[PDB]
């Protein structure tokens, strides 16, 4: 990928770590029943002033060696191509070709 995309990813992760607790509090306010019914309106209006990049759902998994946004596996942190390269070189403990 380009150099700017990984920069975007790092920025997103940082902000999402920074603003975690505030969002949890506001969402507890909005979700909980028997609330004042005006604190609800104020909280809904306030949750949209925090920066957009602070929501965990704006993040996209990428391979840690190249940056590819498609074909990602979670157990290994890499894409299919690099998984196969490492596997044949012998660098993934326990992995081997399977038949049955």
């Amino acid at each position: 990928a380009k150099q700017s995309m990984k920069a975007r990813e790092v920025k997103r992760v940082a902000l999402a770590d920074k603003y975690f607790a505030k969002r949890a509090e506001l969402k507890a306010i909005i979700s909980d029943v028997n609330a004042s019914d005006e604190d609800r309106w104020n909280a809904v209006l306030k949750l949209q002033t925090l920066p957009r990049d602070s929501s965990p759902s704006r993040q996209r998994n990428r391979c840690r060696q190249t940056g590819r946004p498609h074909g990602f596996l979670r157990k290994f942190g890499l894409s299919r191509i690099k998984v196969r390269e490492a596997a044949m070189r012998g660098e993934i403990p326990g992995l081997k070709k399977a038949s049955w």
């Binding site: 299919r80 596997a87 403990p93 326990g94 081997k96 070709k97 399977a98």
Partner: protein
């Protein structure tokens, strides 16, 4: 296994995990000391419960 189109031509891999369980019925102080003062290989994961 191809960097572009071809949609057949796949590879299938496997990982296996082996598990064992051992019971000690009447531990003594010397036994617990001996156990806790042991070291084993670097590919074996050991968990001890009282």
């Amino acid at each position: 296994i191809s960097p572009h189109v071809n949609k057949d031509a796949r590879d299938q891999y496997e990982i296996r995990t082996h598990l064992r369980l051992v019971d000690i019925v009447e531990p003594t102080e010397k036994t617990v000391d001996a156990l806790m003062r042991l070291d084993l290989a670097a590919g074996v994961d050991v968990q001890i419960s009282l």
